[PDB]
Amino acid sequence: LPLEPVVGAATAAATAGQVNLIDPWIMNNFVQAPEGEFTISPNNTPGDILFDLHLGPHLNPFLQHLSQMYNGWVGNMRVRVMLAGNAFTAGKIIICCVPPGFASQNISIGQATMFPHVIADVRVLEPIEIPLDDVRNVLFHTNENRPTMRLLCMLYTPLRAGPFVIAGRVLTCPSPDFNFLFLVPPSVEQKTRQLTVPNIPLNNLANSRVPAMINKMTVSTDQNQVVQFQNGRCTLEGQLLGTTPVSASQVARIRGKVFSTASGKGLNLTELDGTPYHAFESPAPLGFPDIGACDWHVSTFKVDQNLSGDPMSRLDVKQNAPFAPHLGSIEFTSDQDPTGDQLGTLAWVSPSTSGARVDPWKIPSYGTHLAPPIFPPGFGEAIVYFMSDFPIVSGNTAQVPCTLPQEFVSHFVEQQAPVRGEAALLHYVDPDTHRNLGEFKLYPDGFITCVPNTGGGPQNLPTNGVFVFSSWVSRYYQLKPVG
Amino acid sequence: LPLEPVVGAATAAATAGQVNLIDPWIMNNFVQAPEGEFTISPNNTPGDILFDLHLGPHLNPFLQHLSQMYNGWVGNMRVRVMLAGNAFTAGKIIICCVPPGFASQNISIGQATMFPHVIADVRVLEPIEIPLDDVRNVLFHTNENRPTMRLLCMLYTPLRAPFVIAGRVLTCPSPDFNFLFLVPPSVEQKTRQLTVPNIPLNNLANSRVPAMINKMTVSTDQNQVVQFQNGRCTLEGQLLGTTPVSASQVARIRGKVFSTASGKGLNLTELDGTPYHAFESPAPLGFPDIGACDWHVSTFKVDQNLSGDPMSRLDVKQNAPFAPHLGSIEFTSDQDPTGDQLGTLAWVSPSTSGARVDPWKIPSYGSHLAPPIFPPGFGEAIVYFMSDFPIVSGNTAQVPCTLPQEFVSHFVEQQAPVRGEAALLHYVDPDTHRNLGEFKLYPDGFITCVPNTGGGPQNLPTNGVFVFSSWVSRYYQLKPVGT
Amino acid sequence: DGTSGAGQLVPEVNAAEPLPLEPVVGAATAAATAGQVNLIDPWIMNNFVQAPEGEFTISPNNTPGDILFDLHLGPHLNPFLQHLSQMYNGWVGNMRVRVMLAGNAFTAGKIIICCVPPGFASQNISIGQATMFPHVIADVRVLEPIEIPLDDVRNVLFHTNENRPTMRLLCMLYTPLRAPFVIAGRVLTCPSPDFNFLFLVPPSVEQKTRQLTVPNIPLNNLANSRVPAMINKMTVSTDQNQVVQFQNGRCTLEGQLLGTTPVSASQVARIRGKVFSTASGKGLNLTELDGTPYHAFESPAPLGFPDIGACDWHVSTFKVDQNLSGDPMSRLDVKQNAPFAPHLGSIEFTSDQDPTGDQLGTLAWVSPSTSGARVDPWKIPSYGSTVTESTHLAPPIFPPGFGEAIVYFMSDFPIVSGNTAQVPCTLPQEFVSHFVEQQAPVRGEAALLHYVDPDTHRNLGEFKLYPDGFITCVPNTGGGPQNLPTNGVFVFSSWVSRYYQLKPVGT
């Protein structure tokens, strides 16, 4: 290779506080990378990306567990590539070393030979060993994200034999130039956390919009519908968006004070614990329903007395032009007499006119710092929604969709993990036989996408599996079809 | 110069992949930089800015062409400055070296003495040589944006001389210059060069109506502001407003016909059948913007089976139901249009009887627009490009714009960065290659000039080609064009 | 490579004889007379990088005697040397060529690679005559790649970017291939330790060292080149032996327009003239699109004249006069009859409205010539009134065989009662206006293009751009390119030979 030898730990020996050691049995065995599975099929053209890495301590699950009590790292790692072919095949492969700070859209196979490369045949027997060295700009890497040295593997000549696919594995162990740098109290710094997904089956996740359970996932019928839900919106760093509450006993709730004028009878909106509502950036009080273009039916009760009568009194809210909850004022009608304070929940909806149809894929017009919409991205990636049984009269369906469940939002808020990639990769896993049922992507804005089969998506999967985080991938990572 | 000796690649030899040598003949002659030209004038005051350059490999057209092959760079340069004045213009200048990390955003002429500086007169014959050193904090410089050293030229004493003083800046590298990591050439976007297309003026298409550019002119009242919505594209390639890419998408309307009790209408979609989203764009891409008039759109029906006469002329009035931001217009026509209608604006007419049509206004979409274009002062005016178009009862029969469509389609394709406050353009006759005028190209996407008294750019031939010259500052004074 | 686990089925090293040519001195000659001698990067001198003309296929459709690749000795055989060649002027020295071949353990065949001296110019060197040059006969089953020195036989002290003959490598098939199969071969080059560029020149100014590029525009943003509309589909024709001779949208890769091809995307299908009206009827005396007079020359018509033949035209014009009152437009109806002769600059029309003076208009919609005929959008009009006049049309386009098919670009356009309601072309207008500005030289017989998805940067199909200005493909059985997504980007990959076997596109 045209690479000069680099030095790992002699530059950061004098200017850092400490230089710490590593258990010598980690330096010897080769441990498989997180995304270290790739196949080569005869349907592949020359030029397809097969794998893609970048240098760090996350390429080895011992270094990732050791780095949570340290502060810096330097050094080079060693990579193995192991193919599985026999003596009756033909084809080549290319593995190039892209330097840090190089940004480009696509690299052809003619431009891939201008990097320091290794062109390896398919029929090889001993595994290919490639040095992955550290080309630094500073003395030592601290615990932030910063672009590092990449490997890039592409097909070079197409595969010919005589559905024979060829499977490959990537294995990685550090060189003796690897070192950690400063003893820190473990798992306290935010920069060394890792994102995790709760260990709860799908038939025990609550809905994030109505108070019911999730029973089956679908994809929408339209494949480019744009959704702008305001309940169940939260990014991966634990920043709530819209009117998303935290717990699951706060979804689709209403608390306010009743005023009685000659104009009608209405509600002055407060929050769900007695604090007065502030109109700074929230479109509504935290816990307000977002079912748009319908007629709500909220059943409340009287709060601060020793009640002797029948407390429950249904209230009917119509989404006309006086409906403006952003100012903290909705108008209702009823058959009982609700006075004072009323804490209630949304029971069921109704259409506006006498013959209209309730479309639960829409949001009301509040009157103002809304949540941003969700466009369906990439190549064939479809946003997976979660349906739930809820009483909707005179509608096309009885299923209410969402993007994330409530126990995901209540976990992302407490966890406060950072984002180390451009997307996440999940694995739907049966909890009995531990077999992988399908893979999904988790984007940094909080919506799960997938690539479905023709005529079948995630709805064909059973409803008692458990999501499991795997690793961080790029945005253009290819998924497998589900169905 | 009061500066320590600064080493080159001796620090970056350890932690980089390669260290690469260059030609020993580049370090001998002084070549004019692509950011060289500046002017001194008695309009200036002691304390202005004549040029400012950040240290890099883009200060020399040999190092710029070499840096598309490499990744990093380390080392110093040498700068040499020429002036051209008589023995009747008295005054000094001052060229100082501001280190990186010094942030004050205003430097008095008494504070610029406290840097490493060269104080030079304007009556000098031999040029002035000053070394620009690479004071840095890191081991080497990756081809991206980090603060490097600055040259900074100010007027140090008032100029008692329309006489301007031309100046040029010539650079050559020191013997300590070195590039670092070989990549494939011309793949990164960060080391690209801005070009202007090599087309004559009469072979350029208009950007507001479907016609060809006839001549250039300036306005009569040169303090009128314009807010055109087609032909708006910044130099980095970001489209603004409703500007389309190609030249066959200009002033075209496509939508589905709906009938109601009050006339007919069109439910607007995009220009290929894709549904329109009411977002950041004020209209579907390619919507016309000739305001305060009545349109005449001639459409046909997108259908495989047509008979008789497939054309229909829709007359759109800009009354209160004209609201293209919501996604609906109205029309009146004597034919019977149905289904998906696609058409192009044909001619415009006055709104009421006796009134006249103004082609400089824009319609009212609302009942997220592009920012207005203000003239940048210093006795300049905006160059407009005129084109013949059928206009009844108007002042002129010609429609202006701010950029040709090929310029927009070139800036979108190239995506070159911006290294200056303006771009100086020449206008050359393509036979004898003489020069006819100087124009500035601002990074907001419009071309200005300084018109002569009694004339302007409308007295020039109409077959000249624009040629990129250099990157200049905001106060470069242009020679007046005209007669 | 893979000599470890390939068994002993294939040979590993090509046993070759030394070539019958003496070694050639390098850059020591141009030290006394040239101005400068410029050193280059030592990291280039020992890395084998794939040449731009570095792809070929050996398919069992090839006969013995087909040209696989053909290289002229220059600095354009290496992308580092090509990118350095735009800065300097002149060069000397030798190169080092390396050919990669890896078939199965089942295939069979041989190739022959010969060195032709400068000045020996002949067409169709056979495989009998290629033996008489210094040659190496290599197998198609070897593992270690063949290395061939490309010496620099010359008459003068050093070279220059003008037109002079240089040495050639010429690799042809020798015995037929015997096994759905091809053999992907790659050619990799590296300079000798005697290579040297000579004189510094302003970079990327001269024409002879340029590089052909294709625009970075998606498919749905390209304009049609025969009617004013946008491209929305790529199809192939049914009759694969139908000849097409279009007039608009014809441009060679060197950037030299043919026929009535305009430059801008707003000049297509336009007519400008001054209306005369005798006692017989009404007509137009044709001028150019900017008022300049039109003379009978190499073009058969003014630039931008429409070319949909054997039909009726409906053109909607307007007066060029400033003072307009009332209804400005006027629809003209043209028949392709005997008084239709745009080569002499006169047509004849009828209209309900009355336009006079100067008129400028655009073709609106077409119509059949008779009450029960059809509209074929694949024909062209007869420009000359008498058929024997030399009107200097563009030459017809023939498909180059090997199962290939020409790609057409369709657009929605109001055709009344035709075969389909779409108009084809050969090149988009943004390709013509990009080929005219660049003026890049052509270094092969085709240009392999890839149709790339703009987001995931995948690969959807291979295409070939021929130097006469059209794009071909090999359609799959019962499919074609009309199944592809309509927002891809054509990227340039390599310069290939005329007999490159593409992969079938579509389903």
Give the class of chain A from helix and strand content and strand pairing: mainly beta
Which fold name fills CATH's third level, the topology of the domain at 253-350 in chain A? Answer: Elongation Factor Tu (Ef-tu), domain 3
Number of alpha- plus pi-helical segments of chain A? 2
Architecture of the domain at 253-350 in chain A in CATH? Beta Barrel
Which CATH C-level class of the domain at 253-350 in chain A is it?
A: Mainly Beta
Shape of chain A: elongated
Strand order of the largest sheet of chain A: 13-14-17-16-15-18
Quick one: which chains have the greatest interface?
B-C, 62 and 60 residues
Distance between the termini of chain A: 45 Å
Rg of chain A (C-alpha, Å): 28 Å
CATH-assigned homologous superfamily of the domain at 253-350 in chain A: Positive stranded ssRNA viruses
Count of extended strands of chain A: 24
PDB class: virus like particle
Keywords: Caliciviridae, Calicivirus, Norovirus, GI.7, virus like particle
Assembly: trimeric
Entry title: Asymmetric focused reconstruction of human norovirus GI.7 Houston strain VLP asymmetric unit in T=3 symmetry
Question: Any overview of this molecule?
Answer:
The structure is a homotrimer. With 483 residues, chain A is mainly beta. Chain A has a domain at 253-350: Elongation Factor Tu (Ef-tu), domain 3 (Beta Barrel), CATH 2.40.30. Chain A has helices spanning 63-66, 406-415, and strands at 31-40, 49-54, 72-74, 77-83, 90-98, 117-121, 128-132, 141-142, 150-160, 166-174, 179-180, 216-218, 253-260, 265-269, 295-302, 313-318, 329-334, 341-350, 382-383, 385-387, 423-429, 436-442, 448-450, 466-473. The interface between B and C is large, with 62 and 60 residues.
